[PDB]
Ligand binder design. Sequence first.
Ligand SMILES: Nc1ncnc2c1ncn2[C@@H]1O[C@H](COP(=O)(O)OP(=O)(O)O)[C@@H](O)[C@H]1O
Ligand SMILES: Nc1ncnc2c1ncn2[C@@H]1O[C@H](COP(=O)(O)OP(=O)(O)O)[C@@H](O)[C@H]1O
Ligand SMILES: Nc1ncnc2c1ncn2[C@@H]1O[C@H](COP(=O)(O)OP(=O)(O)O)[C@@H](O)[C@H]1O
Ligand SMILES: [Mg+2]
Ligand SMILES: [Mg+2]
Ligand SMILES: [Mg+2]
Lengths: 369, 370, 370, 370, 370
Amino acid sequence: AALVVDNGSGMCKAGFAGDDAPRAVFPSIVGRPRHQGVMVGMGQKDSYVGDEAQSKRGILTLKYPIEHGIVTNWDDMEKIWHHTFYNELRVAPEEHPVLLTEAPLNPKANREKMTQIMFETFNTPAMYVAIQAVLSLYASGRTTGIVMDSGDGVTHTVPIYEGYALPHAILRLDLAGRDLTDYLMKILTERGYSFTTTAEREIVRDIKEKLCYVALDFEQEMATAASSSSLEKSYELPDGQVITIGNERFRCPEALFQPSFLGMESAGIHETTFNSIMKCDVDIRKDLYANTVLSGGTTMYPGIADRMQKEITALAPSTMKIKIIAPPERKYSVWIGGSILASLSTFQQMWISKQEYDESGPSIVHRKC
Amino acid sequence: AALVVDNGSGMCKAGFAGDDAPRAVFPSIVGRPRHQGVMVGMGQKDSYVGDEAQSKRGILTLKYPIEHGIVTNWDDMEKIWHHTFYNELRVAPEEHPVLLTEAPLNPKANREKMTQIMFETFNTPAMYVAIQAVLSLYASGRTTGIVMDSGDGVTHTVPIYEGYALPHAILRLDLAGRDLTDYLMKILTERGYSFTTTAEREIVRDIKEKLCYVALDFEQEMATAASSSSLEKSYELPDGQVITIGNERFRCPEALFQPSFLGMESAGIHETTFNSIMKCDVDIRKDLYANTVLSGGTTMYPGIADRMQKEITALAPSTMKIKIIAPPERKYSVWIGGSILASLSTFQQMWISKQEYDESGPSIVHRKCF
Amino acid sequence: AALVVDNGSGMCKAGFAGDDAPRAVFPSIVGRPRHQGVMVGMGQKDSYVGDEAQSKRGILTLKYPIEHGIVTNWDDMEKIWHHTFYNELRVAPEEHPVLLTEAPLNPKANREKMTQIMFETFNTPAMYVAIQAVLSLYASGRTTGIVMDSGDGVTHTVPIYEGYALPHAILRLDLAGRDLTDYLMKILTERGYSFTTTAEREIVRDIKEKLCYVALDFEQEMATAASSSSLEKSYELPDGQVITIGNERFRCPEALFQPSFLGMESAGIHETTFNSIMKCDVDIRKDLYANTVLSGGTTMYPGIADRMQKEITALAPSTMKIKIIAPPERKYSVWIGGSILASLSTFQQMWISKQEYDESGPSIVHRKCF
Amino acid sequence: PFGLTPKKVYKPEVQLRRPNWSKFVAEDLSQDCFWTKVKEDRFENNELFAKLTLAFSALKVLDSKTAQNLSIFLGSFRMPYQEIKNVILEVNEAVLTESMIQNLIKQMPEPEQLKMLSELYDDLAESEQFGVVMGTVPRLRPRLNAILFKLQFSEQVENIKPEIVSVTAACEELRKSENFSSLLELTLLVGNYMNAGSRNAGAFGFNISFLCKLRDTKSADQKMTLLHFLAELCENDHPEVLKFPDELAHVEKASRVSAENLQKSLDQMKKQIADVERDVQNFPADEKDKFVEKMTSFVKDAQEQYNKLRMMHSNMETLYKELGDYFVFDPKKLSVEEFFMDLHNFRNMFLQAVKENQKRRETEEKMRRA
Amino acid sequence: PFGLTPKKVYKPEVQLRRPNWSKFVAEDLSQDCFWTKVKEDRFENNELFAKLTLAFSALKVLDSKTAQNLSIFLGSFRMPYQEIKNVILEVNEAVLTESMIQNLIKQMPEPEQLKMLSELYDDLAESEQFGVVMGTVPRLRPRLNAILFKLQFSEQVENIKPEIVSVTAACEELRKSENFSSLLELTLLVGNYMNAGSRNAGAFGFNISFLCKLRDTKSADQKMTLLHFLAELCENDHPEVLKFPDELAHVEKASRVSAENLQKSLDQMKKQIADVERDVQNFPADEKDKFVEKMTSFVKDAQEQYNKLRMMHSNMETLYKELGDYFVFDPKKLSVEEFFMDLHNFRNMFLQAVKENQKRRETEEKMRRA
Ligand SMILES: Nc1ncnc2c1ncn2[C@@H]1O[C@H](COP(=O)(O)OP(=O)(O)O)[C@@H](O)[C@H]1O
Ligand SMILES: Nc1ncnc2c1ncn2[C@@H]1O[C@H](COP(=O)(O)OP(=O)(O)O)[C@@H](O)[C@H]1O
Ligand SMILES: Nc1ncnc2c1ncn2[C@@H]1O[C@H](COP(=O)(O)OP(=O)(O)O)[C@@H](O)[C@H]1O
Ligand SMILES: [Mg+2]
Ligand SMILES: [Mg+2]
Ligand SMILES: [Mg+2]
């Protein structure tokens, strides 16, 4: 029974093979105590990783070991992988092969480091690495379609034609969810609410994850909010106070489609899907326009599928139909797509054995995967 | 002659346009007598505001109308303006446009209420709310440079490149002089003194204003100060007693560079400015690394410019040169810039006239102002 | 005092007839600010054209008015010509005839539009348009040969004969400097350096223009790069950061000879020169094969003459002789040829004078200048 | 000859593959050449001949691509294929979906591959076992194709409907537009005035799309434009012409779609129903398969719905050809997309042109008041 | 026509901008269309035209081919031709370049053309005036043809000499190659075993190029090959024969050229040197022409250097004919290219054959360990 460990920028997923609805799901967070522990009786640990660090976030610091896909700190991630394998899954990695996922267009050093860690620190019998968006396609059942994935810091649009991707037209944008959360707390200050600490960062993420929607027409929706308070909602803080958000509900989700608010020259996430299409063949675009499957947690705003279809239509010629798919479990599309890979008996021959790694080192991954 | 007013979290500076003198300057505090009245021959005033409140500080519970730059009480703030326009400047706001200043990232309510209160109560022919940090750059005469404006309550940096600001890279920190004065009381308890009253807060402010400095290097000072009594600059209390402050003369401004002393998770004022520039574009960083300007009262400690310059260079690129500009008059930098702004000929068309406010309402301040 | 202007996707070369070097060589970019001009007084002139846009590129939207040779915006193109005539050259076109250059296989609509702009907006007394590739041989002395013209957006191999380009043998390849610069960003990410905005495009262009060469072979060069670090080079960004490219030095211009790396089915610039020759006559093939002349700034990679000659050898017949010619003036080749053409005493005959333009309208440019 | 012919008899037990070489008789080379003293004994032995004569002694059903893709697809929905076969047999609208059926037929191999599997169970893989169950259903290729009309026929007819009604409404709206006629007259008269004494003097009409070219005409001063001239003239003394853009409300959708695209779509769906008609005759009809009237009766309403589309599509040809004769242009050199997009863009130009006239007047009023 | 052509004579006093629209002659629309009854009167007046005009108030002897080409070439270098005439006369290696004169001799017209020019100054064109200057020099046509000797004679020897010395070096290396003899013996004895009882039974030798045909021979299993069997056999019990590819190092250089090409090149050089001897006798030898000994004494070293090209190339014939008898093949049915490129292909294919043997062995070792 192989394993799948889809590490994410802001939250990680884990579970066995031949499964859906990932089992061991906890945020990729590492926090260490900030103050001095007066109590002696308590068994305070050096660091809290995962779900434990979220409950006690009042005194912790909540450092992210992964940012924009590229791993900044590798010392703490070994805690995360050890945490995933031993406590959450309770499985010895020395007997069961492990699968990994990784974003496209990333430095070769990052994926080489994972190869080193699993084979000596964990001593996995075999390991494989696959692109995230390729897993996202045949999690929807198809094999020919552009995958537009948006996580915390990575927004990559990978056109796909078959079991093989198209590296020529792979695009990327640093406009994903984590950047929007920092924007939400920036626009919460005009209302008199200030959020600065990393503990108060997680609070703002829950405001976005519950009271934020994508407006079909931003220009029209602005007049409705200003004319009357027909869109205001109230949210309760853990301490007990309640705050009200007006036009901040749709302003921060829409920065994807107008990144000029964030001060970035990059074109909108709607346009980066259209531009990524024109980099492929003219014959190919027929199948690539009707299968624009959306994946990733950031693509779960209410009305995002409707908004994308309207804006893509204006850019594209009328001769081509547009169909923005949206599977019900689009949040965990990456995990389930890789889950069926290990189920196949044919995939056994596509492993990176320890003997192969020993004779080639970490460089074996580049020629194989 | 336009009227320039700079209301701050701890002290207000209001004068005329063109003249380089801030004219009347007095603290922005209001106090109400908490003691019962006995003598009736002499006339007794209501709650005291302005500089008169500091004279009788021993009986009044002084209250600050402005907290962290955000106006917490709008009742006492109108009292100061009447104390300003009539008692001090002896001018009628009935014919003088009045400039206002407001920190960036401030709630929209404060800039609205400033427009509403002044238009209906003072009926000034015009008005304007202008950012303090951007206003201070006029005093220096430059046109680019990330400006640190550390007032009594607010600490914000605005990167300006060739006259075009970068609002996406504006960083504001809620750590300033007022927070330090509370830290000074917390460290004085260790030696064995007490300061737990709002009348004793002004006195502790004079401990920090006159006998505080920022060390060039900090980890060595504790070794030096503990070993020998090199620095023991003593201070006399208003009653007549005398106090001695040792290594705490420099620990108080140290929190600006290590806010972990106050328990806050925010970075110091040396890291924030570096982080603010990193949010900008690659090309414009060259003209911002070597053009760091300073202003405000909190940037008047000894060694603040030298300490920041050493700390920035520990993070800046090696080939990059760091030049922490600090004019001698950085205390009034905001106001001097305001006087130049009002007297500009091209500025006459930017005023928010009386007729425009009525037909647009209090939201006009979000259209004709930055 | 004839003027010669060579419009290009990347840069535009302007000057006077009879000179040896262009008077002004500035990028053909039009930029407008995207931020808000908080600074009063200055910050005007939102239309920055030419070198001014390059200097302030950190706060501008760098948009190229020319893409793939064809003009995608005819509003800022008039600005560039206005800037060239009045700022860089400082001359009134009211008395100076002007010569222009056109790309091979240009649409008939674009060429006729340029006639109207010269004759109405600037009302030059005369104007002529000449093929870009033909002017390369006029500058290279010889009147017969094949021009491997290149540049920022277009790559044309035009085997002219007696100064008249053969129309059926012209081959166009969509592989020029801009695609090479864009490919550099995609491959640079493999090391850990990312460049997205148009402001950082010029940084990648400068890296390409300095630290990239063409390798003769790859079956041994790739092993050499991986085995040893002898070929690494270091570049300093305007931020002051240090980046080492190394392996990606020769992989950026090799897309010219192996476009399959970019995913394009078309063959490289070495193979398009071969096919363009075969379309010509058999008897004239002898002269054009040994008279290949390079042009355009895209052909300034060191090691391009020996690489192309070696690759062109195997496909060429054994008895045939090959001589790739690389004049020192590759960058300005298409300009000096226009200077030679205009300086002729016989060039007065086929002037498109203003008197004869009105009678035949803008359609005269189709039958006069050919 | 020269004592160099010791013919070695071999007589192999098993015949081998004889290699054919050019014969070298021992008459020419036997005089004095190489191979006269071959050390045959130094290689001759028993082991070599015995070994040499031995060597020269004279997902399974699916291919690589389909085996993995079918295995991936069969696990994509993780549901039994036995119910899937019954679902497609009964045409169950809940389980069946357009996306599910579209990428299903991609996973069918050639029809031959599904035949011998039935004649040939648990040993075979899930991909091979799926084909056995699916292949048992007769006429797999047409029946699965037979499903995929009603899943999309409703979608196609509802998409052509807003494409046709918008163009026809745009044609009718432009037919009755008096303001369009009023605007057109003004251009012709003023244009004829300036074109006097030229090749276009007193022109009795101009082709369409020239109005969008009026902006390209400038004046003595570059700010003043001919397109803006008409808007400025109209607003002064000839009103009610500015209302023509409001008269046309479906031109944008009319410009978006073209009749050429519609004709291809209509021709395709005609072939779709024809396949069902051949299916009905080839496969006479029930209880086992719930297809019953889901297709034969669907065609009845499809042909009824189709006939209305043919009339509506033919309504363009009657209307557009008259429209083509109205403006004098055959619907062969000009189509719906190019003509209306040109007019769609013209509407944008005029509203912008009258907008800039107001802006210039605003500055004109500003300087007059000052 | 249809009573709809009342042409309006305008005759503007001041010429205006004339917009160019597509002409509509009153034939195609005159019959029955729109604009037949344009109300031109409701717009015509005298104010509008007065306002409208305010804003918009505005070679003698040379043929065609050579005359322009010569004029272009003269301006290409842009330097006085009198000096250039001295350069070619004085043979100045600095100004004179190969490229300058190869197209120069093309620019020379027929020798008769330059004659009357001398007999017939400023009135004539730049090409005609230059025609007189070149025509003055006696025997122009042979003189420049005499100049194109040292620019190639020194180039020809260094281009051919590595080719000349590489062929012999391979021949001597192949002459002493014992490993080649050992390999050849193995094929002959083994091959005769398979050919027993056939038309090639007991063959005492075979023609060259058969070794590369060993790959085409297969075995009972398609994986095994006859040539690969020899590679596998030698590595088992007959080593030291794998070093024959290393024994030959100049395989690629010698096989790329043929003696036939060198014979033609040498023959042409003899003809080139013959023209000088005729020129010297015809033109006796000064101060005016510094070519003096630069060409006749060049022959003195040329003949010495050309002599060394004879015997060594003669050593080719002596060695190759001996090599031809060594392998039993006349140097008439087989040349350097055909004989050696076949052997060079054998060297590459043998290394590949032993490479696949190692690859095949690796899979065998992998399964044995598993
Ligand atoms: N309902 C929701 N609405 C908006 N954003 C959401 C929602 N749910 C999750 N997100 C965003 O998804 C991000 C993380 O989800 P996920 O896709 O699992 O991360 P990753 O793609 O990095 O693995 C969070 O930053 C959060 O902002
Ligand atoms: N000479 C000084 N030395 C040290 N600190 C000073 C000095 N002058 C002013 N300050 C500090 O500046 C703070 C506020 O002063 P100021 O900048 O004038 O207020 P604001 O910026 O709100 O107008 C006070 O808290 C005080 O601690
Ligand atoms: N030394 C160099 N090495 C490699 N590329 C260069 C060099 N110099 C210029 N380039 C590229 O060539 C382009 C200039 O092309 P140019 O000949 O000006 O085209 P055009 O003639 O169309 O203006 C630049 O965009 C640059 O990217
Ligand atoms: Mg993910
Ligand atoms: Mg202040
Ligand atoms: Mg060019």
